Amino acid sequence: MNEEYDVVVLGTGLTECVISGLLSVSGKKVLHMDRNPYYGGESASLNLDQMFEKFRGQDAKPPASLGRSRDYNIDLIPKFLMANGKLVKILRMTGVTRYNMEFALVEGSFVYHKGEIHKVPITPTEVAKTPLLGFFEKLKAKKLVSYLYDYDQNNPKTHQGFDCSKDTMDKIYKYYGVSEDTTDFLGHAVALYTDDSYMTTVPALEVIERMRLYEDSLNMYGKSPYVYPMYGLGELPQVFARLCAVYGGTYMLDKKVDRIVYDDNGHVVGVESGGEVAKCKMVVGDPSYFPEKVRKTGKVIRVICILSHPVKSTENAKSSQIIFPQKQTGRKHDIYCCVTSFTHHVAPNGKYIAIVSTTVESDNPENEVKVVLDLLNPIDEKFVYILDTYAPLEDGKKDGVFISKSYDATTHFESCAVDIVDIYERITGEKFDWNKKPVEP
Amino acid sequence: MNEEYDVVVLGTGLTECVISGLLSVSGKKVLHMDRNPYYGGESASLNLDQMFEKFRGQDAKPPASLGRSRDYNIDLIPKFLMANGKLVKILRMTGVTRYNMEFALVEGSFVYHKGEIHKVPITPTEVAKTPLLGFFEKLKAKKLVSYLYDYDQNNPKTHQGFDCSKDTMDKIYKYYGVSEDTTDFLGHAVALYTDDSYMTTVPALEVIERMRLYEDSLNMYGKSPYVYPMYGLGELPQVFARLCAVYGGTYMLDKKVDRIVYDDNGHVVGVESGGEVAKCKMVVGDPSYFPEKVRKTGKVIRVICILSHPVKSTENAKSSQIIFPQKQTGRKHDIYCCVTSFTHHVAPNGKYIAIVSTTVESDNPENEVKVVLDLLNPIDEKFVYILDTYAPLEDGKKDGVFISKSYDATTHFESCAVDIVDIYERITGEKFDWNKKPVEP
Amino acid sequence: MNEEYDVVVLGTGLTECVISGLLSVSGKKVLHMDRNPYYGGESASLNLDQMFEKFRGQDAKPPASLGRSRDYNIDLIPKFLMANGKLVKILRMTGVTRYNMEFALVEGSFVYHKGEIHKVPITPTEVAKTPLLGFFEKLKAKKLVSYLYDYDQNNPKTHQGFDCSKDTMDKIYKYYGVSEDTTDFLGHAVALYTDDSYMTTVPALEVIERMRLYEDSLNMYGKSPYVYPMYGLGELPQVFARLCAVYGGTYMLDKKVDRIVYDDNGHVVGVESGGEVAKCKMVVGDPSYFPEKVRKTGKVIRVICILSHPVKSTENAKSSQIIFPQKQTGRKHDIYCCVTSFTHHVAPNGKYIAIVSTTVESDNPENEVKVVLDLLNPIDEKFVYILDTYAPLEDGKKDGVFISKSYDATTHFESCAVDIVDIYERITGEKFDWNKKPVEPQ
Amino acid sequence: MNEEYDVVVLGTGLTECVISGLLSVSGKKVLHMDRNPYYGGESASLNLDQMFEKFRGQDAKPPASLGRSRDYNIDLIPKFLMANGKLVKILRMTGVTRYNMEFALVEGSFVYHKGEIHKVPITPTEVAKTPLLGFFEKLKAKKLVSYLYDYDQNNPKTHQGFDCSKDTMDKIYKYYGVSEDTTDFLGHAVALYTDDSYMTTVPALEVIERMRLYEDSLNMYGKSPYVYPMYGLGELPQVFARLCAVYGGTYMLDKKVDRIVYDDNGHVVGVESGGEVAKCKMVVGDPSYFPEKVRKTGKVIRVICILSHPVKSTENAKSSQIIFPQKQTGRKHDIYCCVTSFTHHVAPNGKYIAIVSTTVESDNPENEVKVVLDLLNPIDEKFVYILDTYAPLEDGKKDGVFISKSYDATTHFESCAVDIVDIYERITGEKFDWNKKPVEP
């Protein structure tokens, strides 16, 4: 405490934890602090007593019918990992995945359409029979998926008049005559886009590669391409604090940040806590530590629901991804629902945690997610969690202050992984090297 | 019973079950029989009462201190699965992985050396710090393992003077100056070879692929590269019997086979049971059904131990792989010990199943594994299970009789998977297509 | 022409011509250049006047007794094709073999032993009676060759204690008690190995496959397993230049290369010629175009002999393969002699071209082949052709420069075909697909 | 002349010569006779003086403008050999190919279509560019020919919905939508069928084998699949007579056959010539020797033309096969025209032999081939050679008299080879062994 460090990291959300670990295994001396006595900040993992204290009052105690409090590990901002996606690869680079850490598969992958949720179809055979599509759209979509699944960039016989390395997806969509019913599950539930702007801005080959990653992971784990840590995302700050200890640093909880110390040029030189100042060349943290350097970008509502039953139409799946595309709901933002339960040891036996999340568009944020909550009824206990979202004004290169974005409403980790890579590139000034390997402590 | 079939399959060991499943999803009409009223044959799954009847006498009763008899699911021939290895990939092709069949990971991977048990090192950092190696061998082995994981055949920068597609491992071993201390854990515990003859007979790239499979399998769930079914291998005949039913067939248990019916040219034409003959073009079975068409290849001892404690030096692992390389024991065959417990629901709470297996070299097989049994003490109950091993004289193309090999002493499924692939290739006359998908019933 | 191309190919030796043709039928846009006004470079096809200018002087004229100069098509580096071997299959893939191109059979296949040359024995009956072996070795080699031709990998009755998929040839040789006299003609004249290292490094099943290839080709064409193009190897660049034209390109002769253009990372981006620069992703060529990227591997002497008579003991053969195994001559390299004549339209009527080749071991290269030349006497005209051999330092994947090896002394094309396959694999990064089929020209 | 023999052979047509040769190299004692002082009988090789004597009169002498009479070797029944076809393989088994007998390739292979002669396309690239097909048929036939050459019976991936071991060509033809423009050159000029009945009577895989034979023969030397002996087919009887003496027999020319001698059961026992009888177990001969044991099957016209120019549209080919499919000529039988010249030393330098042959349908045989003769004009000399054709009533097993068929109109040897194999199988009672090797003289 109060030394000289290469970097000071503020906050124990996943983005800061991963950046901090990447710096430590690269040889940097890291001081990592958090003002709270717990990990995660806005993305903390709470038990049932903590949920009632936070959402109902200091005196409020949970009813016995909800079960034993310490059986709950409720991640306030739950997200699944794509089995071989960017975050999984970044976590492997830090080495924390080899610890006493288990990833378990998610049982379900579902998408919404006309008041019902259905399994996400992958193969041309499944698309030709999927209840998501009408009779005439099934035929057009079966041909589209056959072409995309049979496409080989190096084999011109499969090109059939398109160069997906250069052409965008909108031309391929219009050629096969598919509607929003096809592009929704394809673009949002398989390729994991959050809006349809990709149809004109990215080559079709990139979209095809994303669908292949979904199929690759799905065939590896069976039921879905998604994994989630046993006991929930709260395990990640724990392993990263042990990782920091292995490399000589320590995670300091319950340490309030008095001020950031800047020089005459406005560049960071230290962080002051309890009258002591720790010198550093850079500082990294989430928006809450630099109110003067961020701007509000919107709101996200998350409604956390404890259920005593699986979601109808998911075939009694005990954990599940459910996508609500905006064009199926009359919205400009998708709604996301992820379901976890005792199978990931986040809830007692027979309990399910279903968390519904979306970007706020109106004056009645709760009403925006009513379409999802109606599919979850009956709900034993419901907690409304609305947060403001922030983004840094500058990239950090001028002032040495590298600030992460708040977590968006998606229930997968791609956008958090994209932010992690971007922050690390802003720190190092170099393109992210996916082959960098840790140094001996 | 008395019909026509494409293939008749005899015995419900895993090899027969997987081949039988492959034939059904490929569209063939299969009659699958077993003379026993139970699944598995010599590799059956026994509870405690069944164990005592088999190994102690019809009248011998288990002591109450062993716990509830039906809490035990003891596989007589236990083997772990590589999480992304050949058998799991074949199982994915049959579709049984989508059924209600749950795999839980194995916690530990250990190798024996100079009287001690140690973790299997994978990363260059782990190899640089492992107690398996001396001060200077750590450095030689660190450079070797770094080179192998960074080796890319299509990237010439990583070759560093070797072409592993043509060069063998012995030239690379002598170049880095590693000893048996390195080649043992690397070749036997990571690459899963059973002797060192690979050092001259296979390209180094074949060894590298095996190391990548280990890292890939470990990266899937964490902790170790091995998985094992909940309730043990006895779930596999259950799911494959259901798969057969989906395709219209039935698994007939308790049906003794009177004779195999051949034509004048010696080719199979039917199987006779209870005075009825079922016509077929081919027959598939384990050696016990065709004594006149196999030859004895040796014996394998399996010593089954019930423990009330984890194995010393495995860090209280509740499931574990332990390899005893032959060069560490003064033998010509490796000894294998796999540990499972309540965590795979094969033993009651607080109980461990430790099974020691090796190829028999002498007149006192139990004494051959004494080095391992001494590390397990104290042992609550010990059962000595010695079996003869067999291999077919012909591959089946001339007579239509396709016979599997007996299960070898290894505690992983690689060699059994190779036998499955070979048998299927001999049956179909085609190279095994690792991309085949099931057909609709 | 100075455009943008996928690949630039430099030199018209056979290796470059085949690589260029394979790239064109795969759809690539190829620029093919040569500094000479003629094809082939060191492997060019010369007439008699051209031979005398090259080997005797600008003023030297051939004597009338040698016949019409333009009746000669002398390949400076002659090699036979194994009838269904790798090169024949690669040539078929390009389609150049379907042109106005005829392959003709070679009449003889002979091997040297104790001062004599004899027909290569194939069947166990021929092996049991060949003058290449002594009395007891005939019997030992008859049982060995009987075992190899009766070997069936799928039939265990024929294994007789050996698994030729795993066991090597040295164990089979030593078990049958054969000496160098058997392994020489068998390994060098039938299976076409150039040294005996295969006996420990390659499975016997591969060796058996090579002997079967020889026997199968021999039964198809009769006299020998070898074919040779009518009018000689100079026909190959001609059809390959026509093949390039079908795919829109042109073979540019007499085009000197000013400089190769590389980027700051050292990778090729273009080739500069006559003040013009043609951009390219890769460049392909023989060692002479990249002196700084190759190393000397040795020398090869070729002695080109015009005869007015067939070679003695070849039964008046008008074309012939003749192998001189190194263990039969006290050397560390085999000597090769191939004979062609009017029957392949490479020499006038009554004339024979016998070319003797070996890797140079000493300071007197001509004397190293004297054992062969003495068997050819009398010799009307003799030309000594000594060449340096080279091999590239890198495979081309780092810098984009894919360089061929110099042609070795062998008078068959397997090692050249292995070089072509390797080069093409280095270019595409994929294992050579022997089933790849041409695309239609645009 | 009056000895005992295993077999007596009568006539020196090729069929008799090859059967005689096969018998000799198998060890049988053969007597071979002919009533003529010359070889070949109806298929003899004539020089120019002999042609005018045969077709113009004893007194007619050829004009000097035709060149040196002995420069001509005109085979009255000319046929080309498939470079790797059935007859070539039989010739290899007899060993005559190692003699001083030279085969030279034929330069051109052409087919007639809608009034024009065009090169025969073999590869998919040639079919994709051939003038035989319209624009859209070019594409469909390319896919058809690709499918046939890529077909592997043991690989079901290449089947693409057809089992060519059982399916016929008509279903595959109709599926790819090819017309007679494709089936004519494919079936008649490539596969060498004489009518389209194969489309329904033989498995498609037989057709694929025939196409491979064409491609294989073409790949042996180049330019075309056909070879022809230097100096013409008259060289074949010469080597077989030399072969016969080497194996202990004798060829007796100019020996008239008085009678065949039969026993009381009607089986042959000897042949009588010049008051001497040679006993034998069997007799083999052409129809002219057994008039009471054969029946007339029709007629064949062969028109022999001497040209001073190559055939139009054959690209100045100096030797050529030209097929005229019946559907292009308004006939029920194909017309065949083969061209040879000085390059096979059958004509003087600058002269061409063009022989047109077809089965006779009408009372004016010459008019039936007029469509071809008009394409040859100008013709220096024309000879009309009409023959009756015969076939045996019995197969010879009962009476020991094995009779060959007369030569059909085709200008390739496939049917003559089929007759040879059939006759030899009738003699031996065994299926023809294509791997049998000669015995030592």
Walk me through the domains of chain A, giving residue ranges and CATH numbers. Answer: 1-56+226-297+390-441 (3.50.50.60), 57-119+298-389 (3.30.519.10), 120-225 (1.10.405.10)
Q: Is B374 exposed, middle or buried (0-12, 13-18, 19+ CB in 10 A)?
A: exposed
Strands C30-33, D74-75: pairing is unpaired
- Alpha-carbon C328 to chain mean position: 22
Q: Exposed e or buried b for every residue in D40-50, given b needs 16+ CB within 10 A?
A: bbbbbbbbbeb
For residue C378, cis peptide bond before it (omega within 30 degrees of 0): yes
The reply to whether C397 touches chain B by the CB within 8 Å rule is: yes
**What type of residue sits at position C385?**
Y
The reply to whether B308 touches chain A by the CB within 8 Å rule is: no
Angstrom distances, CA of residue A424 to CA of A433, C190, C377: 10, 64, 80
Closest CA of chain D from C226, distance in Å: 12
CA dist., res. C18 & res. D180, Å (int): 38
The reply to whether A101 touches chain B by the CB within 8 Å rule is: yes
Inter-chain contacts counted by CB atoms under 8 A, chains A and B: 32
Spatial neighbors of D115 by CB under 8 A, at least 6 apart, are none
Chain D residues touching C95 at Cβ < 8 A: 123, 125
Angstrom distances, CA of residue D297 to CA of B67, B262, D223, D399, D412: 94, 49, 36, 22, 20
Q: Would you call B222 and A102 a contact, using CB atoms and an 8 Å cutoff?
A: yes
Q: Would you call D123 and C220 a contact, using CB atoms and an 8 Å cutoff?
A: no
On whether the CB atoms of residues D276 and D417 are closer than 8 A, the answer is no
CA dist., res. C183 & res. C193, Å (int): 10
**What type of residue sits at position C411?**
T
What 3-state DSSP class applies to A430? coil
The reply to whether A98 touches chain B by the CB within 8 Å rule is: yes
CA dist., res. D62 & res. C228, Å (int): 41
On whether the CB atoms of residues C280 and C271 are closer than 8 A, the answer is yes
Strands D30-33, D4-10: pairing is parallel
Q: Is A161 exposed, middle or buried (0-12, 13-18, 19+ CB in 10 A)?
A: exposed
On whether the CB atoms of residues C103 and C227 are closer than 8 A, the answer is yes
CA dist., res. A241 & res. A40, Å (int): 12
The reply to whether C97 touches chain D by the CB within 8 Å rule is: yes
Q: Give the CA dihedral C352, C358, C360, C361, nearest 10 degrees.
A: -130
* DSSP H or E stretch at residue A127: helix A124-127
The reply to whether D316 touches chain C by the CB within 8 Å rule is: no
CA dist., res. B202 & res. B224, Å (int): 26
- C416 C-beta neighbours (distance < 10 Å), count: 25
**What type of residue sits at position B210?**
R
Q: Which of residues 147 through 186 in chain D touch B, CB cutoff 8 A? A: 154-157
Q: Give the CA dihedral A159, A163, A165, A168, nearest 10 degrees.
A: -120
Indicate which of D81, D119, D139, D223 best probes the interface with C, i.e. most C CBs within 10 Å of its own CB: D223
Strands C30-33, C7-10: pairing is parallel
On whether the CB atoms of residues C373 and C356 are closer than 8 A, the answer is yes
- A434 C-beta neighbours (distance < 10 Å), count: 11
> DSSP assignment, residue A299?
E
Nearest residue on chain B to C155, alpha-carbon basis: B394
| Residues constituting chain A | 441
CA dist., res. A80 & res. A227, Å (int): 6
| Selection from C45, C108, C106, C33 nearest residue C76 by Cα | C45
Residue bearing tokens 């018998």: D23
- Alpha-carbon D4 to chain mean position: 33
On whether the CB atoms of residues A268 and A48 are closer than 8 A, the answer is no
Q: Would you call A100 and B128 a contact, using CB atoms and an 8 Å cutoff?
A: no
What 3-state DSSP class applies to A391? strand
Inter-chain contacts counted by CB atoms under 8 A, chains B and D: 5
Sign of CA dihedral D280, D285, D291, D294: positive
CA dist., res. C221 & res. C103, Å (int): 11
* Cβ-nearest to D98 among C103, C222, C440: C222
Name the packing angle between helices A204-221 and A169-176 (round to 10°).
80
Resolution of the experimental model in angstroms, please?
A: 2.6
| C101-C104-C108 Cα angle (round to 5) | 155
| Selection from A237, A248, A269 nearest residue A31 by Cα | A248
Residue bearing tokens 């690792």: B434
**What type of residue sits at position A215?**
E
* Cβ-nearest to B156 among C154, C166, C395: C395
Chain B residues touching C167 at Cβ < 8 A: none
Angstrom distances, CA of residue D50 to CA of D46, D224, D254, D352: 6, 31, 18, 17
Spatial neighbors of C235 by CB under 8 A, at least 6 apart, are C101, C229
| C239-C245-C247 Cα angle (round to 5) | 110
The pair phi, psi for residue B271, each rounded to 5°, is -125, 135
| A293-A297-A302 Cα angle (round to 5) | 120
Q: Exposed e or buried b for every residue in A217-246, given b needs 16+ CB within 10 A?
A: bbbbbbbbbbbbbbbbbbbbbbbbbebbee
Nearest residue on chain D to B435, alpha-carbon basis: D157
What 3-state DSSP class applies to D33? strand
Chains that touch B (3 or more CB pairs under 8 A): A, C, D
The reply to whether C264 touches chain D by the CB within 8 Å rule is: no
CA dist., res. C121 & res. C190, Å (int): 8
Sign of CA dihedral D329, D331, D334, D335: negative
Strands D320-324, D108-113: pairing is parallel
Q: Would you call A219 and B125 a contact, using CB atoms and an 8 Å cutoff?
A: no
Nearest residue on chain C to B166, alpha-carbon basis: C201
What 3-state DSSP class applies to D340? strand
| D159-D216-C207 Cα angle (round to 5) | 90
On whether the CB atoms of residues D227 and D221 are closer than 8 A, the answer is yes
Structural tokens at position C383 = 């030309």
Indicate which of C82, C98, C344 best probes the interface with D, i.e. most D CBs within 10 Å of its own CB: C98
- Alpha-carbon B168 to chain mean position: 26
The pair phi, psi for residue C414, each rounded to 5°, is -60, -45
Structural tokens at position A186 = 């394809």
Based on its alpha-carbon atoms, the radius of gyration of chain B, rounded to whole angstroms, reads 23
**What type of residue sits at position A78?**
P
Q: Is B377 exposed, middle or buried (0-12, 13-18, 19+ CB in 10 A)?
A: exposed
**What type of residue sits at position B184?**
D
Bridge partner residues of A207 (DSSP): none
Bridge partner residues of A303 (DSSP): A356, A384
Chain B residues touching A104 at Cβ < 8 A: 221
Q: Would you call B98 and A222 a contact, using CB atoms and an 8 Å cutoff?
A: yes
Residue bearing tokens 């394809």: A186
Structural tokens at position C319 = 């074309």
CA dist., res. D197 & res. D207, Å (int): 12
Q: Is A259 exposed, middle or buried (0-12, 13-18, 19+ CB in 10 A)?
A: exposed
Spatial neighbors of A370 by CB under 8 A, at least 6 apart, are none
The reply to whether B222 touches chain A by the CB within 8 Å rule is: yes
Q: Would you call C95 and D125 a contact, using CB atoms and an 8 Å cutoff?
A: yes
Per residue, what are the HEC states of chain B? CCCEEEEEEECCCHHHHHHHHHHHHCCCCEEEECCCCCCCHHHCEECHHHHHHHHCCCCCCCCHHHCCHHHCCEECCCCEEECCCHHHHHHHHHCHHHCCCCEEECCEEEEEECCEEEECCCCHHHHHCCCCCCHHHHHHHHHHHHHHHCCCCCCHHHCCCCCCCCCEHHHHHHHHCCCHHHHHHHHHHHCCCCCCCHHHHCEHHHHHHHHHHHHHHHHHHCCCCEEEECCCCCHHHHHHHHHHHHCCCCEECCCCCCEEEECCCCCEEEEEECCEEEEEEEEEECHHHCHHHEEEEEEEEEEEEEECCCCCCCCCCCCEEEEECHHHCCCCCCEEEEEEEHHHCCCCCCCEEEEEEEECCCCCHHHHCHHHHHHHCCCCEEEEEEEEEEEECCCCCCCCEEECCCCCCCCECHHHHHHHHHHHHHHHCCCCCCCCCCCCC
On whether the CB atoms of residues C151 and C158 are closer than 8 A, the answer is yes
Which stretches does DSSP call E strand in D178-307?
Answer: 226-229, 250-252, 259-262, 268-273, 276-285, 294-307
**What type of residue sits at position D46?**
L
- Alpha-carbon B227 to chain mean position: 12
Structural tokens at position C172 = 């089979």
Bridge partner residues of D328 (DSSP): none
Based on its alpha-carbon atoms, the radius of gyration of chain A, rounded to whole angstroms, reads 23
On whether the CB atoms of residues B22 and B92 are closer than 8 A, the answer is no
> DSSP assignment, residue C308?
S
Spatial neighbors of A265 by CB under 8 A, at least 6 apart, are none
Q: Is C435 exposed, middle or buried (0-12, 13-18, 19+ CB in 10 A)?
A: exposed
The pair phi, psi for residue D181, each rounded to 5°, is -60, -35
Q: Would you call A97 and B223 a contact, using CB atoms and an 8 Å cutoff?
A: no
CA dist., res. C423 & res. C412, Å (int): 19
On whether the CB atoms of residues B108 and B35 are closer than 8 A, the answer is no
What 3-state DSSP class applies to C421? helix
CA dist., res. B220 & res. A219, Å (int): 13
> DSSP assignment, residue C190?
I
The reply to whether B393 touches chain C by the CB within 8 Å rule is: yes
Q: Is C73 exposed, middle or buried (0-12, 13-18, 19+ CB in 10 A)?
A: buried
- DSSP secondary structure string, D177-215? T--HHHHIIIIIIIS--SSTTHHHHSBHHHHHHHHHHHH
State which approach was used to obtain the coordinates: X-ray
For residue A378, cis peptide bond before it (omega within 30 degrees of 0): yes
What 3-state DSSP class applies to A228? strand
Chains that touch D (3 or more CB pairs under 8 A): B, C
- Alpha-carbon D435 to chain mean position: 23
Q: Is A114 exposed, middle or buried (0-12, 13-18, 19+ CB in 10 A)?
A: exposed
| Selection from A80, A90, A319, A105 nearest residue A219 by Cα | A105
| Selection from A222, A185, A249 nearest residue A4 by Cα | A249
| Selection from A104, A81, A421, A102 nearest residue A239 by Cα | A102
Bridge partner residues of D358 (DSSP): D301, D335
CA dist., res. B118 & res. A251, Å (int): 30
Q: Give the CA dihedral B266, B268, B271, B277, nearest 10 degrees.
A: -90
Structural tokens at position B6 = 């494409």
Q: Exposed e or buried b for every residue in A14-24, given b needs 16+ CB within 10 A?
A: bbbbbbbbbbb
Chain A residues touching B105 at Cβ < 8 A: 102
CA dist., res. A188 & res. A394, Å (int): 30
CA dist., res. B100 & res. C18, Å (int): 57
The reply to whether D105 touches chain C by the CB within 8 Å rule is: yes
Q: Which of residues 418 through 437 in chain B touch D, CB cutoff 8 A? A: 429-430, 433
On whether the CB atoms of residues D430 and D291 are closer than 8 A, the answer is no
On whether the CB atoms of residues D390 and D405 are closer than 8 A, the answer is yes
Inter-chain contacts counted by CB atoms under 8 A, chains C and D: 35
CA dist., res. D145 & res. D208, Å (int): 10
Name the packing angle between helices A414-428 and A14-25 (round to 10°).
40
* DSSP H or E stretch at residue C381: strand C381-392
| Residues constituting chain B | 441
> DSSP assignment, residue C188?
I
CA dist., res. D135 & res. D128, Å (int): 9
Q: Give the CA dihedral B8, B10, B13, B15, nearest 10 degrees.
A: -40
CA dist., res. C411 & res. C398, Å (int): 33
- B350 C-beta neighbours (distance < 10 Å), count: 11
CA dist., res. C427 & res. A57, Å (int): 70
For residue D378, cis peptide bond before it (omega within 30 degrees of 0): yes
Structural tokens at position C76 = 């400076």
CA dist., res. B180 & res. B202, Å (int): 18
**What type of residue sits at position C35?**
R
